[PDB]
Coordinates of C-alpha atoms in Angstrom, one line a residue:
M1477 CA 99.2 36.5 -51.4
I1478 CA 100.9 34.2 -54.0
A1479 CA 97.4 33.6 -55.6
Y1480 CA 96.9 37.4 -56.0
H1481 CA 100.4 37.8 -57.5
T1482 CA 99.7 34.8 -59.8
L1483 CA 96.2 35.6 -60.9
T1484 CA 97.2 39.2 -61.6
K1485 CA 99.4 38.1 -64.5
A1486 CA 96.6 35.9 -65.9
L1487 CA 93.3 37.8 -65.5
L1488 CA 92.4 40.4 -68.2
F1489 CA 89.9 42.8 -66.6
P1490 CA 87.5 44.4 -69.1
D1491 CA 87.5 47.9 -67.6
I1492 CA 89.4 50.1 -65.2
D1493 CA 86.9 49.9 -62.4
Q1494 CA 87.2 46.1 -62.1
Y1495 CA 91.0 46.4 -62.4
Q1496 CA 91.0 48.9 -59.5
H1497 CA 88.7 46.8 -57.3
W1498 CA 90.8 43.8 -57.9
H1499 CA 94.0 45.5 -56.7
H1500 CA 92.1 47.2 -53.9
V1501 CA 90.4 44.1 -52.5
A1502 CA 92.2 41.0 -53.7
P1503 CA 95.5 41.6 -51.8
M1504 CA 93.8 41.7 -48.4
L1505 CA 91.4 38.9 -49.4
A1506 CA 94.4 36.8 -50.3
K1507 CA 96.1 37.5 -47.0
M1508 CA 92.9 36.5 -45.1
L1509 CA 92.5 33.2 -47.0
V1510 CA 96.2 32.4 -46.3
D1511 CA 95.7 33.4 -42.6
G1512 CA 92.5 31.3 -42.4
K1513 CA 94.4 28.2 -43.5
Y1514 CA 92.4 27.8 -46.8
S1515 CA 94.1 25.4 -49.2
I1516 CA 96.1 26.8 -52.0
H1517 CA 93.3 25.7 -54.4
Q1518 CA 90.6 27.7 -52.4
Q1519 CA 92.9 30.7 -52.4
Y1520 CA 92.9 30.6 -56.3
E1521 CA 89.2 29.5 -56.4
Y1522 CA 87.8 32.3 -54.3
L1523 CA 90.1 35.0 -55.6
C1524 CA 89.2 34.1 -59.1
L1525 CA 85.6 33.9 -58.2
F1526 CA 85.7 37.4 -56.7
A1527 CA 87.3 38.6 -60.0
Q1528 CA 84.7 36.9 -62.2
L1529 CA 81.5 37.2 -60.0
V1530 CA 81.9 40.1 -57.5
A1531 CA 84.1 42.7 -59.1
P1532 CA 81.7 43.2 -62.1
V1533 CA 78.9 44.3 -59.6
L1534 CA 81.0 46.6 -57.3
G1535 CA 80.2 49.6 -59.6
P1536 CA 82.5 52.4 -60.7
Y1537 CA 85.6 52.7 -58.5
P1538 CA 84.8 55.5 -56.0
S1539 CA 87.8 57.7 -56.5
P1540 CA 87.8 60.8 -54.2
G1541 CA 85.3 63.3 -55.5
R1542 CA 83.9 61.0 -58.1
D1543 CA 80.1 61.4 -58.4
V1544 CA 79.0 57.8 -58.0
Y1545 CA 76.3 55.9 -56.1
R1546 CA 78.1 55.4 -52.8
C1547 CA 77.9 52.8 -50.1
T1548 CA 79.4 52.4 -46.6
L1549 CA 80.6 48.8 -46.7
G1550 CA 84.1 48.8 -45.3
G1551 CA 83.4 52.4 -44.4
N1552 CA 83.4 53.8 -47.9
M1553 CA 83.1 51.1 -50.5
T1554 CA 80.6 48.7 -51.9
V1555 CA 82.6 45.7 -50.6
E1556 CA 83.5 44.6 -47.0
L1557 CA 85.8 41.9 -45.7
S1558 CA 85.4 40.1 -42.4
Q1559 CA 86.9 37.2 -40.6
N1560 CA 85.6 34.6 -38.1
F1561 CA 88.2 33.1 -35.8
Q1562 CA 88.3 29.4 -35.0
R1563 CA 90.9 27.4 -33.1
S1564 CA 93.1 26.2 -36.0
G1565 CA 91.8 28.5 -38.7
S1566 CA 89.6 31.3 -39.7
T1567 CA 86.6 31.9 -42.1
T1568 CA 86.5 34.9 -44.4
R1569 CA 83.3 36.5 -45.5
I1570 CA 82.9 38.9 -48.5
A1571 CA 79.9 41.3 -48.2
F1572 CA 79.0 43.7 -51.0
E1573 CA 76.1 45.7 -52.4
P1574 CA 75.6 44.6 -56.0
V1575 CA 75.6 47.8 -58.1
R1576 CA 76.2 48.8 -61.7
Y1577 CA 77.1 52.2 -63.1
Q1578 CA 73.5 52.9 -64.2
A1579 CA 72.8 53.5 -60.5
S1580 CA 75.4 56.3 -60.5
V1581 CA 74.0 58.0 -63.6
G1582 CA 70.3 58.1 -63.2
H1583 CA 69.0 54.8 -64.7
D1584 CA 68.5 53.0 -61.4
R1585 CA 67.9 55.4 -58.5
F1586 CA 67.5 52.8 -55.8
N1587 CA 69.8 50.1 -57.3
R1588 CA 67.1 47.4 -57.7
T1589 CA 68.3 45.5 -60.8
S1590 CA 72.0 44.8 -60.0
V1591 CA 71.2 42.1 -57.3
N1592 CA 69.2 40.3 -59.9
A1593 CA 72.1 40.5 -62.4
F1594 CA 74.5 39.2 -59.7
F1595 CA 72.3 36.3 -58.7
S1596 CA 71.9 35.2 -62.4
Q1597 CA 75.7 34.9 -62.4
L1598 CA 76.2 33.5 -58.9
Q1599 CA 73.8 30.7 -59.4
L1600 CA 75.7 29.5 -62.5
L1601 CA 78.9 28.8 -60.4
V1602 CA 77.5 28.1 -56.9
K1603 CA 74.6 25.8 -57.7
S1604 CA 73.5 25.4 -54.1
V1605 CA 72.5 29.1 -53.9
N1606 CA 68.7 29.4 -53.8
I1607 CA 67.2 32.8 -54.3
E1608 CA 63.5 31.9 -53.7
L1609 CA 63.7 34.0 -50.5
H1610 CA 65.0 37.0 -52.5
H1611 CA 61.8 36.9 -54.6
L1612 CA 59.6 36.3 -51.5
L1613 CA 61.2 38.9 -49.2
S1614 CA 62.0 41.7 -51.7
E1615 CA 58.4 43.0 -51.6
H1616 CA 58.2 43.2 -47.8
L1617 CA 61.6 44.8 -47.1
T1618 CA 62.5 47.0 -50.1
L1619 CA 61.0 50.0 -51.8
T1620 CA 58.5 49.0 -54.5
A1621 CA 57.2 51.1 -57.4
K1622 CA 54.1 52.1 -55.4
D1623 CA 56.2 52.9 -52.3
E1624 CA 58.4 55.1 -54.6
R1625 CA 55.5 57.1 -56.0
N1626 CA 54.2 57.7 -52.4
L1627 CA 57.6 59.0 -51.4
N1628 CA 58.6 62.6 -51.1
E1629 CA 62.1 64.1 -51.1
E1630 CA 61.5 65.4 -47.5
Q1631 CA 61.3 61.9 -46.0
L1632 CA 64.2 60.6 -48.1
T1633 CA 66.5 63.5 -47.3
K1634 CA 65.8 63.0 -43.6
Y1635 CA 66.6 59.3 -43.8
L1636 CA 69.7 59.9 -45.9
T1637 CA 71.2 62.3 -43.3
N1638 CA 71.1 59.6 -40.6
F1639 CA 72.1 56.5 -42.7
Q1640 CA 74.1 58.1 -45.6
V1641 CA 73.3 55.7 -48.5
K1642 CA 70.3 54.3 -50.5
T1643 CA 71.3 50.7 -50.0
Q1644 CA 68.4 48.1 -50.2
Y1645 CA 70.3 44.8 -50.6
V1646 CA 73.6 43.5 -49.4
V1647 CA 74.9 40.0 -50.4
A1648 CA 77.4 38.1 -48.3
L1649 CA 79.5 35.2 -49.5
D1650 CA 80.6 33.1 -46.6
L1651 CA 83.7 31.3 -47.8
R1652 CA 83.5 28.0 -45.9
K1653 CA 86.2 25.4 -46.5
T1654 CA 83.5 23.1 -47.9
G1655 CA 81.9 25.6 -50.3
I1656 CA 80.3 29.0 -50.5
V1657 CA 77.0 29.7 -48.7
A1658 CA 75.3 33.0 -49.5
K1659 CA 73.3 35.4 -47.3
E1660 CA 71.2 38.4 -48.3
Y1661 CA 70.4 41.5 -46.2
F1662 CA 67.3 43.6 -46.8
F1663 CA 67.3 47.2 -45.5
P1664 CA 63.7 48.5 -45.2
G1665 CA 64.7 52.0 -44.1
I1666 CA 63.7 53.8 -47.3
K1667 CA 60.6 51.6 -47.7
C1668 CA 59.5 52.6 -44.2
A1669 CA 60.2 56.3 -44.9
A1670 CA 57.8 56.1 -47.9
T1671 CA 55.1 53.9 -46.3
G1672 CA 55.4 55.0 -42.6
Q1673 CA 55.5 51.5 -41.3
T1674 CA 58.0 50.5 -38.6
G1675 CA 61.1 48.5 -39.2
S1676 CA 59.8 45.7 -36.9
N1677 CA 56.5 45.7 -38.8
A1678 CA 58.4 45.2 -42.1
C1679 CA 60.9 42.6 -40.9
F1680 CA 58.5 40.5 -38.8
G1681 CA 55.8 40.7 -41.3
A1682 CA 58.2 39.4 -43.9
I1683 CA 59.2 36.5 -41.7
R1684 CA 55.5 35.5 -41.0
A1685 CA 54.8 35.8 -44.7
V1686 CA 57.5 33.2 -45.5
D1687 CA 56.9 31.2 -42.3
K1688 CA 53.3 30.0 -43.1
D1689 CA 53.3 27.1 -40.6
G1690 CA 54.2 29.4 -37.7
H1691 CA 57.4 27.6 -36.8
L1692 CA 59.0 30.9 -35.8
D1693 CA 56.1 32.8 -34.3
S1694 CA 57.1 32.1 -30.7
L1695 CA 60.6 33.4 -31.4
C1696 CA 59.3 36.4 -33.2
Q1697 CA 56.9 37.4 -30.3
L1698 CA 59.7 37.0 -27.7
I1699 CA 61.9 39.3 -29.8
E1700 CA 59.1 41.7 -30.6
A1701 CA 58.2 42.0 -26.9
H1702 CA 61.7 43.0 -26.0
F1703 CA 61.9 45.6 -28.8
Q1704 CA 58.6 47.1 -27.7
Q1705 CA 59.6 47.0 -24.0
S1706 CA 63.2 48.3 -24.5
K1707 CA 61.9 50.9 -27.1
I1708 CA 63.9 49.9 -30.1
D1709 CA 62.9 49.2 -33.7
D1710 CA 64.2 46.5 -36.0
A1711 CA 66.8 47.9 -38.4
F1712 CA 67.1 45.2 -41.1
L1713 CA 66.9 41.5 -41.8
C1714 CA 69.1 38.7 -43.0
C1715 CA 68.4 35.3 -44.5
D1716 CA 70.3 32.3 -45.9
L1717 CA 70.0 31.9 -49.6
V1718 CA 68.8 28.3 -49.2
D1719 CA 65.5 26.5 -49.5
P1720 CA 63.0 28.7 -47.7
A1721 CA 62.1 25.9 -45.3
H1722 CA 65.7 25.4 -44.1
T1723 CA 66.8 29.1 -43.8
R1724 CA 67.8 31.1 -40.8
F1725 CA 66.4 34.6 -40.3
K1726 CA 68.3 37.2 -38.4
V1727 CA 66.7 40.5 -37.2
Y1728 CA 69.2 43.3 -36.5
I1729 CA 68.8 46.3 -34.2
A1730 CA 71.2 49.3 -34.2
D1731 CA 71.3 51.2 -30.9
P1732 CA 72.9 54.7 -30.7
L1733 CA 73.1 54.4 -26.9
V1734 CA 76.5 52.7 -26.8
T1735 CA 76.6 51.6 -23.1
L1736 CA 77.3 48.3 -21.5
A1737 CA 74.0 48.3 -19.7
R1738 CA 72.1 48.8 -22.9
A1739 CA 74.1 46.1 -24.6
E1740 CA 73.3 43.7 -21.7
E1741 CA 69.6 44.6 -21.9
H1742 CA 69.5 43.4 -25.6
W1743 CA 71.8 40.4 -25.0
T1744 CA 69.3 38.9 -22.5
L1745 CA 66.2 40.2 -24.4
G1746 CA 65.4 42.3 -21.3
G1747 CA 65.6 39.3 -19.1
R1748 CA 63.7 36.9 -21.4
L1749 CA 66.9 34.8 -21.8
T1750 CA 67.8 33.1 -18.6
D1751 CA 69.8 30.1 -19.6
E1752 CA 73.4 29.5 -18.4
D1753 CA 74.9 30.2 -21.8
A1754 CA 73.4 33.7 -21.9
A1755 CA 74.8 34.2 -18.4
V1756 CA 78.3 33.0 -19.2
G1757 CA 78.5 34.8 -22.5
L1758 CA 77.4 38.0 -20.8
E1759 CA 80.4 37.8 -18.5
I1760 CA 82.8 37.3 -21.4
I1761 CA 81.1 40.2 -23.1
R1762 CA 81.4 42.4 -20.0
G1763 CA 85.1 41.9 -19.8
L1764 CA 85.7 42.5 -23.5
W1765 CA 83.7 45.7 -23.5
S1766 CA 85.5 46.9 -20.4
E1767 CA 89.1 46.2 -21.6
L1768 CA 88.4 47.5 -25.1
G1769 CA 86.9 50.7 -23.7
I1770 CA 84.0 50.7 -26.2
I1771 CA 83.5 54.4 -26.8
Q1772 CA 80.1 55.9 -25.9
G1773 CA 79.5 58.4 -28.7
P1774 CA 76.7 61.0 -28.9
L1775 CA 73.2 59.6 -29.5
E1776 CA 72.5 62.0 -32.3
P1777 CA 73.3 60.2 -35.6
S1778 CA 74.5 63.7 -36.8
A1779 CA 77.4 64.1 -34.4
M1780 CA 78.2 60.3 -34.1
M1781 CA 79.1 60.3 -37.8
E1782 CA 81.4 63.3 -37.6
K1783 CA 83.2 61.8 -34.7
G1784 CA 83.5 58.6 -36.8
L1785 CA 81.7 56.5 -34.2
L1786 CA 79.3 53.6 -34.7
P1787 CA 76.4 52.3 -32.7
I1788 CA 76.0 48.9 -31.1
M1789 CA 74.3 46.3 -33.1
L1790 CA 72.8 42.9 -32.4
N1791 CA 71.1 40.2 -34.4
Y1792 CA 68.8 37.5 -33.2
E1793 CA 68.9 34.2 -35.1
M1794 CA 65.7 32.1 -35.7
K1795 CA 65.4 28.7 -37.2
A1796 CA 62.4 26.4 -37.4
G1797 CA 63.2 23.9 -34.6
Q1798 CA 64.8 26.3 -32.2
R1799 CA 63.9 26.8 -28.6
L1800 CA 65.1 30.4 -27.8
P1801 CA 66.4 33.1 -30.1
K1802 CA 70.2 33.3 -30.4
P1803 CA 71.8 36.7 -30.0
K1804 CA 75.0 38.1 -31.3
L1805 CA 76.5 41.4 -30.2
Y1806 CA 78.4 43.9 -32.4
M1807 CA 80.7 46.2 -30.5
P1808 CA 81.9 49.3 -32.4
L1809 CA 85.7 49.6 -32.5
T1810 CA 86.2 52.8 -34.4
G1811 CA 88.2 55.3 -32.2
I1812 CA 90.1 52.5 -30.4
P1813 CA 93.8 52.0 -31.5
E1814 CA 94.4 48.9 -33.5
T1815 CA 97.3 47.8 -31.1
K1816 CA 94.9 48.0 -28.1
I1817 CA 92.4 45.8 -29.9
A1818 CA 95.1 43.4 -30.9
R1819 CA 96.2 43.2 -27.2
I1820 CA 92.8 42.3 -25.9
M1821 CA 92.2 39.8 -28.8
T1822 CA 95.6 38.1 -28.1
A1823 CA 94.7 37.8 -24.4
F1824 CA 91.3 36.5 -25.3
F1825 CA 92.6 33.9 -27.7
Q1826 CA 95.1 32.5 -25.1
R1827 CA 92.5 32.5 -22.3
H1828 CA 90.1 30.5 -24.3
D1829 CA 92.5 27.8 -25.6
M1830 CA 93.2 29.4 -29.0
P1831 CA 97.0 29.8 -28.7
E1832 CA 97.6 29.8 -32.5
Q1833 CA 95.3 32.7 -33.0
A1834 CA 97.0 34.6 -30.2
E1835 CA 100.5 34.1 -31.7
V1836 CA 99.8 35.5 -35.1
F1837 CA 96.9 38.0 -34.6
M1838 CA 99.2 41.1 -34.4
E1839 CA 101.4 40.2 -37.3
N1840 CA 98.5 39.2 -39.5
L1841 CA 96.7 42.5 -38.8
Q1842 CA 99.9 44.5 -39.5
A1843 CA 100.1 42.7 -42.9
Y1844 CA 96.5 43.6 -43.8
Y1845 CA 97.6 47.2 -43.4
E1846 CA 101.2 47.2 -44.6
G1847 CA 103.4 50.0 -43.5
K1848 CA 100.7 51.6 -41.3
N1849 CA 101.3 52.5 -37.7
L1850 CA 98.7 50.5 -35.8
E1851 CA 99.1 52.7 -32.7
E1852 CA 97.8 55.8 -34.4
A1853 CA 95.2 54.0 -36.6
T1854 CA 91.7 53.7 -35.0
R1855 CA 89.5 53.1 -38.1
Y1856 CA 90.8 49.8 -39.5
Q1857 CA 89.1 47.2 -37.3
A1858 CA 85.5 48.6 -37.1
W1859 CA 83.4 45.9 -35.5
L1860 CA 83.8 43.0 -33.0
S1861 CA 81.0 40.5 -33.0
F1862 CA 80.4 38.1 -30.2
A1863 CA 78.3 35.0 -29.8
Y1864 CA 78.4 32.2 -27.2
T1865 CA 77.2 28.6 -26.9
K1866 CA 78.3 25.9 -24.5
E1867 CA 79.2 23.8 -27.5
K1868 CA 81.2 26.3 -29.5
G1869 CA 82.3 28.5 -26.6
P1870 CA 82.8 32.2 -27.4
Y1871 CA 83.5 32.9 -31.0
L1872 CA 84.5 36.3 -32.4
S1873 CA 84.6 38.1 -35.7
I1874 CA 86.4 41.2 -36.9
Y1875 CA 84.9 43.5 -39.6
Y1876 CA 87.5 45.6 -41.4
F1877 CA 87.3 49.1 -42.8
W1878 CA 89.4 50.1 -45.8
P1879 CA 92.0 52.8 -45.5
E1880 CA 91.0 56.3 -46.5

């Protein structure tokens, strides 16, 4: 937090919206960098980088009732903080939808230009960021001008009632202790509502358009077969902003059937993953889901939103020289008290030889939400992500929602 207190008396923000995003996001970001054992220089580097690079493209500050282009990152903002837990440290990730006020006031209805503006700034400071995949994938996974002309307000109003926002792109800065690596997410929902194609057709067609030598086709077919068998459509796609030949693609699904049997079906790709690591990780998942008491909300996206409940999500990672696709499970935590989550997390950390994470998890969480009663709060920690390898063991991430 010292870096937030110190940079606050040295940074001159040009407008009130950047000022309010700084004081909204930087305190918790500073706490997480301290908790993650980042050096004091990376605390200043990444806070200052957020101020200079990210806050300008977070858009107008969404005061209650303010008529602005809205997003659901962190629940209600255009920015979301998350944390990946290691043994002797943690890694913080900043995710945001680049947006400028023109999107709120009629000059960019689907917010297409702001991600280009952000990348032109990001690439000046993080030279390793390659956006060749943004130019390649944008056509396949976002609404083009043709798609927009063949779109009627009936298909868009139906899509917006199930998924709230008009988001097409999300950028994630992964703050590794050796330097930032960036990832981009493409949401083809509005494109598919205009063209009628399926999410799997858009996401896997985009991968095969970039993967010309077919290095990923065996992984894509295994995943596509499970989606067609288990009757689920691809929701969106992620990629690393690196050289297109060295990137990782991740295909996401969002299942409104929040049951442990449905989660296990996707974790094993309907039985297509039979290795020992999928079997061990499944048993660690089974116990976490059980002890957390993951709430099965109503399937209808109408009533699941008014109950404040989230679906289950998974992604499947794909790289060129990879044998099998690598799953990761996202368990929704909204509706579960924060102290209950912190009790299972502490027990998890000490069971899997992470005693330093177990000692400080509760006090670190309470400091993220100063003066809040974590026994009544149920909408702060929103997602728990799980992946397992024999090398890494089980590794967990928490995705945080902002207070209302």
